[PDB]
Paper text:
The gene encoding the [name] protein in the GH35 family is a component of a gene cluster containing SusC-like and SusD-like proteins. In this study, we found that [name] specifically hydrolyzes β-1,2-galactooligosaccharides. We propose β-1,2-galactooligosaccharide galactohydrolase as a systematic name and β-1,2-galactosidase as an accepted name for [name].
All the structures in this study were tetramers based on PISA server analysis, although the asymmetric units of these structures were found to contain two, one, and four molecules, respectively. The electron density of galactose in the α-anomer (α-Gal) configuration was clearly observed only at subsite −1 in the WT enzyme complex with α-Gal, whereas galactose in the β-anomer (β-Gal) configuration was not observed at all.
Numbering used by the authors:
A (entry chain A), B (entry chain A), C (entry chain A), D (entry chain A): 20 to 509, 538 to 550
The structure:
Amino acid sequence: VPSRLVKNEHGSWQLIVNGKPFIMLAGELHNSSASTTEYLNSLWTSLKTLNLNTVLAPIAWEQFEPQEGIFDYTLINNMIDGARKNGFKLSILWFGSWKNGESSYAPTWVKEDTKRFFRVKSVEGKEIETISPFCENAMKADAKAFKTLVEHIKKVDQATGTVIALQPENEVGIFQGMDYSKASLAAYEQEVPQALIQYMKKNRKNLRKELLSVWEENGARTSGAWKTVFGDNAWSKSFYTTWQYATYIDFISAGAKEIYPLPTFCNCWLVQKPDDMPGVYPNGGPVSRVMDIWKAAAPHIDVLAPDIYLSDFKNIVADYHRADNPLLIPEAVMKPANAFWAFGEHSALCYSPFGIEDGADNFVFAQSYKVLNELIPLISEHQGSDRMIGVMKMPGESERTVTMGDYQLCIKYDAEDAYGLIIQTGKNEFVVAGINFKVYFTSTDKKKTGYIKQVWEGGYDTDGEWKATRLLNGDETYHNAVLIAKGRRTWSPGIYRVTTYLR
Amino acid sequence: VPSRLVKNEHGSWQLIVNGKPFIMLAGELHNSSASTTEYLNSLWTSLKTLNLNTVLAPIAWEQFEPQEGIFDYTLINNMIDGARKNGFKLSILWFGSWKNGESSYAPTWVKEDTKRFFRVKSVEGKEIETISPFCENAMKADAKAFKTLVEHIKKVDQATGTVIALQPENEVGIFQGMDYSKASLAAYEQEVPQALIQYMKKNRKNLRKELLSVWEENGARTSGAWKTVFGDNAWSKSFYTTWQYATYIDFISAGAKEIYPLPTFCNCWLVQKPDDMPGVYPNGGPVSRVMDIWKAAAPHIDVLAPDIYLSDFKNIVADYHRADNPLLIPEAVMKPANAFWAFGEHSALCYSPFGIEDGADNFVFAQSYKVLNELIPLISEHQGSDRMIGVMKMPGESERTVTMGDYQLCIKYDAEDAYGLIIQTGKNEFVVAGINFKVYFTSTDKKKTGYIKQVWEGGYDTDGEWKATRLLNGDETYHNAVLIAKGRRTWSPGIYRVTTYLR
Amino acid sequence: VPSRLVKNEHGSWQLIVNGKPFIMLAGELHNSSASTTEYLNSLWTSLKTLNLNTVLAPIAWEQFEPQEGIFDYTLINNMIDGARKNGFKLSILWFGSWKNGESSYAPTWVKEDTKRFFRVKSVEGKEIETISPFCENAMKADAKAFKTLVEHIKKVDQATGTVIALQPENEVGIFQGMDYSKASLAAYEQEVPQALIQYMKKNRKNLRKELLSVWEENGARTSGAWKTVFGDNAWSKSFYTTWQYATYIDFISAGAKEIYPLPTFCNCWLVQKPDDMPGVYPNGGPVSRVMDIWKAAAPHIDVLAPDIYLSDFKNIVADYHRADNPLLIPEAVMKPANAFWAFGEHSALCYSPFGIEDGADNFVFAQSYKVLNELIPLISEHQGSDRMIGVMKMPGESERTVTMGDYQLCIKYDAEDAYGLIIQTGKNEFVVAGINFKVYFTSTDKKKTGYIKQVWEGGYDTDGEWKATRLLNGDETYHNAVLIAKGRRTWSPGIYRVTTYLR
Amino acid sequence: VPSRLVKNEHGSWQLIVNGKPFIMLAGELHNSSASTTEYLNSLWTSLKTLNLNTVLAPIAWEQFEPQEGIFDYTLINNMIDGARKNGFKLSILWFGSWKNGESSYAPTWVKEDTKRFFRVKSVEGKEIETISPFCENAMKADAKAFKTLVEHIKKVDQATGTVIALQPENEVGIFQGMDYSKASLAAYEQEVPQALIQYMKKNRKNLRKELLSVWEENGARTSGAWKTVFGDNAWSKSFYTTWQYATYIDFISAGAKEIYPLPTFCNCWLVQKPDDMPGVYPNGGPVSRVMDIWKAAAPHIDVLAPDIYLSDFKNIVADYHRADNPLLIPEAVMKPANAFWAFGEHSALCYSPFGIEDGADNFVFAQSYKVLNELIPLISEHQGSDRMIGVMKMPGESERTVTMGDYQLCIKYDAEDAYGLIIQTGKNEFVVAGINFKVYFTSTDKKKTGYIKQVWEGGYDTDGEWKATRLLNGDETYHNAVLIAKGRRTWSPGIYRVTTYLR
Ligand SMILES: OC[C@H]1O[C@H](O)[C@H](O)[C@@H](O)[C@H]1O
Ligand SMILES: OC[C@H]1O[C@H](O)[C@H](O)[C@@H](O)[C@H]1O
Ligand SMILES: OC[C@H]1O[C@H](O)[C@H](O)[C@@H](O)[C@H]1O
């Protein structure tokens, strides 16, 4: 396969694409932007102006299998063609059974057969425009379509590897405490799957407090029905609903994994505010609260991926990033700081603003992606090490101090919009990227005096070779008292090589 | 003849031009803009930028017959030539005896002979710059000139049919309770024409309340002088004045109809405010109040056409549009909403902003006319059916609900300027055109649940074939909860094909 | 001579240039703009953009005769050359003895010999930077230089006639009650010249009140010294000072007139405010107060020309324009209204903004001059007749009514900046030029009704032929109720041909 | 040598470059702008737009001798090459031991050997990032590197003379009362060098009051230790610290002077406010207070050069300019007035805004340098004479009166930004350059009347020949009452030739 997840020596998961470490400097199209060849093809030049290396774009079941057993390859073919012609990799979003909780992208022939493909019912007993995750017929039909899609991708792309990941479904779940379908009501009475129980036993001290605290308040049982093991409440309802979604979607993924295994992720509509109960967000989706349930149920899903539109960026990405869950953000705001934070602080695989085609001639964002592209080798090499950090000022913060081997770095912000990353490349050498901040280097050991030795500004050329544009000194470094990450001027992030010394 | 009015199966009158249904996406030039070949010819490129299919332009008697019996074809010839070269049809306005009530376009040789062509007198006894409608000499001279014009048009245009309609005179009437000319005073004493009496008898329950109520308050007589049948008052004065105008102008039209019958309309200066008595507007013109008198008197005039500059657009067009009177608006404001309302709600033949050459690079208006042009076949096919409506928000309105077969449509406005039209093309299919509104589809029958199935955005190509630009779903339809008529973006009206379904 | 003043049948003086009536649509350069060939030549294209037919430009004595008896033809030659190449006539300003009262343009060899060329003395006894008009040596030297200049112009221009007028000196006089030079003090005691006395006798009832009232308060004597005939006061001082200037400058002109007689004018710095006594303005200059003295003394000076920078334009031009003194304005503001007023109301020979090279791309002024150029034949033909008037609104005015044969014209202003002219070309025909006003035509005789018959907008082509651009009617003339002088649109003055009629 | 300092007949020092008087119309690059060939080469076209004749640019020791005994000629070679190709001379700044007091440009191999190259110690005993001026090893290493640099310049530039001056080090000194290094503490106890004593004896009445007053308050001794001759205080500390710096740097210069003597200057960080004690500015630098110490100690340094960023420009330049110290300003603000003041009032050798590459398309500054370039021959010829002055209005000033031979000049300012210069070129002739001021010429002798005779505006062509663009008179000189230095218009300084006369 031309795309694979591989753990490095620091325990960090890396994307390896066509034999090399690859980070998705990505963007996701608006939902309807890949619905015709002509509309998509109008976008490619726009996208290139932003220095993307990867485009996230949907394939809709309703278009792909417009009558049962009849498959239309037009949109996937043109999508791969245009990606190749314009220098992009693709992550394919499968808008099948569910997108933002609902079934609006299911085929006309699925929608119209509510007997074969039964719907979620509300507490009021109303069938909604959502296929129930307890419907096995729907599971099989989606799975067959998805597999056919992936089979096709292998048949047209197994050598080039334009397609480097897959997202089955999109932000699944129900805006309800539970599905009131008869099948759902019967499932709630069943025994808790052993696979869940054993997962909880084996990984107890690393479990989500939201799961552990509910398990333990019911006596941490190793058998029983859902209401026995987890009590009769909103959480028990959320847990078995989540188990169902992860299980349905795991089967869908399994079918693809058997014929052409690519990195696979499912994305979640986040718990928007901290008191929100399941169903105010999509109940069943892979929010961090239920991460353990998804891991237990869905081993053919590699990553649980947050869609982040909220301002509390650093806390959110820290919440989703775990040893068993690399950070992968398929939908976000068009804010360069976020990118630098995700890649530098958390070794992310992907950063991707949503509706990216809208953001053409966001010059600063484009130049940010240019600089990140220059740094992909260096970032890759340091994923998971304590020698790489991000930099991102949040309102009300003024400085960040960190230890890097022999040195203490004091990062002070010169403007509200201040961001970058810092890599220690040698005992007395650092690469600093970004804008609107300063770095003071001092000695960890107080018997010694540490100082900047020399500073160069520059970039990496197309061969990956460092080229200095200036040796910064005098005013430009306050006579080596400080690194000023002023940025590249046309202002956008710069790259600075700093040597230090101890006397 | 290459232009004709024909009633379809729904009882709606259609313009059939060169064998096909035609709707005038029109504009009228400023009054003096066709007075030389050079000034007119300077306008054509401007007009094309607005996507007109039809130009309304005057021929002035004073220029056409500058000495009695001598005819100058220069302006009509160049007008037809330029229309052909720039892809426009023409409706010819005949500024003869009267324009905005007055006789300023009559030839020098008519103006200067007030014995042969006697004037209206005021109550003070003053002769004004208006030829009296009781002057038979003036009737004959105008009629002869008009016929000569039309004879010429046949001789140069009978095959191509560049000229598709005729407007004899322009907003006729007097700013007076009545003409005080001796002939006028003698006419007021005469017997009411039987043709009027019989019209009133035959069409009593469909008569204008303004006419019926006056007739019935005088005892609904079937014989007598004007003051007998209608009482001695302002209304009796207006009625016999109107009879005179319609009769004079009918004779003028009759002469043309005999040699080359084209759709013929007379236009009115509207009753500007509801209390206004005859003479505050031109007394004698085809305002809706006297529509029955004009129909009775002038069978060679096909349509009575309002000139609408007032904001109460929907009430006005509803007032002029009758089973015997299609809506045809030769003069209006340059407001796209009005166009969509007139064509969609009332199956109008014509919408035409006045001084159109001024409005070049009114981009939104131009794109509106582009979209209407795309829809002419579909609009044509649905003229007079209960499956086509207009959409136009007025201040203080928030929604419009309508029944369309099995579905209830709730139209909600997203901005003040919200307009379009809606056609049901199938039991479960709709075409929605416009901007700044949303449509919710639900089931008429409350035992059933109705929903959007699929939504496409697109347009009709030059062959008249539908071409989708996107399948709208997800954010673009709130996951098929609603049709968002956002418009085509460059914002101007869009076209959306919606399929629905019942479960 | 290729330029001459000739009185027409209405008593009006006309400029006849190369055999045809010519009106100077003129501009005067800044003072130093003709001081090198290179600076002047940089201006010609600018000037052409303003549609000038005539440029007023200086020749400075100091440059022309830089050593006594040595003459430098460079600047006059290049000036005539560039005028020819760019389609302009020239009026030559001779900055000799005096410019704005002073002698700053006299040659270095005149300035430095205050014995040979004695100065004006102040009352304090100080010699100033002004050559005394009582210095005969200075008179002769200036006269010889001026004649040499004109001799040269004949020698290079007698056939083409690029040079069409001459201005000897520039705004002469002293900022003093009188010259206190010994020669001046001796002149004040002399007998009043008979030529003055006889002029006063012969033209008594047409004399300036300022002169007559002083003469008559001293007993209207026919002999005596200045203080006898005019009393011992400021006026007597001004009169004999003025006599001296006019006499000195007449001799200068006489020398030129003998070899090559061209229209010759002297220009005055105006009495700036009504109480100002001689010497607050240049005492001796041809202000209107002393017009009779200049006429008496200086028969080789054809015209006394006001330099008008003040806002009271209509009163000023009425004050300078007399039967023996055509209106000629060599220096004015760049205001088109002023031009139309001067040419239309007062049949002026010249209108000329000062520092004209500054005003390039004053579009409105340029288009004004274009329209005047079109009208020169028609204006010429009506100079001095009661069938041509100007139009110019001043603050606080609202209308102007005039009688033109059978018609009464009511001119009503539609904006503050409203101006043009009106010519009756036939008993029932008028040409109206301008902008921002309206004209109502009614019958002089109240037994008759007068009205507009027809209105055309247009212009005169390069052959001088009228070409209509539109027949204005309907909205454009309120149905012949009024002429609307809206202007040519791109707004600037238009030309309108109006026919009228009486019934 | 192709560049040399030579005293003219007025006692003024002139730069003679390639055989001719040369004034540096200069600019200094930002500190890091000559750190790569590519960054420098990006600037040349920018610099040419400003009409510089000279660029000041650094060579950094750390780059030039990156390992001991290994020399890298890349940056000096490319610098000379680009200067030649773009028409500039160079003054080379040697950023060696010290730049703005500190040692940030010393080689890595100097910084890292604090035993061989010992640092300054603070009063707290801390070694700082400054090489001590008492370190002989550092003196020798710097001197050897500097000499190698100059040897190279001779080897590549001895014929062309692109390099016309040298600045060893940059704003030297310590932010301390004294160096607390053991060597520094031992030096403070030593005998005052005789060379200082004798200098003070010989030049007593011309000594800086700051030095003389301290010497005399300690009894004006001719022998003793520093604390004996100058007391035990801050001044004694500053004096021996300054002696040390001047001595160290003199040795560095001496090595170069032996093989290739060019004009050499050292620049100072100014006493920023009048109460500031040594160490608030760099203690040891050539501020004016210690000018005598630098002259005594450092005969191989030709000029002590102020870096002026403060608004008190006229007082500062008067303070640094002495008979033994021409004015040379290598760092200043980009303000044209300053340039005119320095060159005109004080016959400066150099005016140079800092960060000049930033100021491209400062049009006014560029045109100022154009005009100065035109005047270099005339300025050169009048350096040190009482016939050349500067003109520069400071806030709160309104006029300046000066005597120039027979004439009194009253300079009155017409705007805040008013500046230029004035040269008397003959008994009755003046050249006035500048903008926004006026000059009134009157007679020194009150028995005589002095006046402007004639005024020309113009410039010097590429051959150095005067070319008048206009003879200014009339309005342009108020009829020779005044010279108006209005400027060249596109507004920037003009050049005006004025002749005057006495009667
Ligand atoms: O723009 C809203 C956004 O909401 C979620 O993040 C979905 O995953 C996206 O497809 C889109 O609907
Ligand atoms: O612009 C005013 C307008 O008034 C009426 O509608 C007329 O029919 C038009 O010709 C025009 O006069
Ligand atoms: O601009 C002022 C103006 O004043 C007078 O009118 C002069 O005749 C002109 O030459 C000029 O000096």
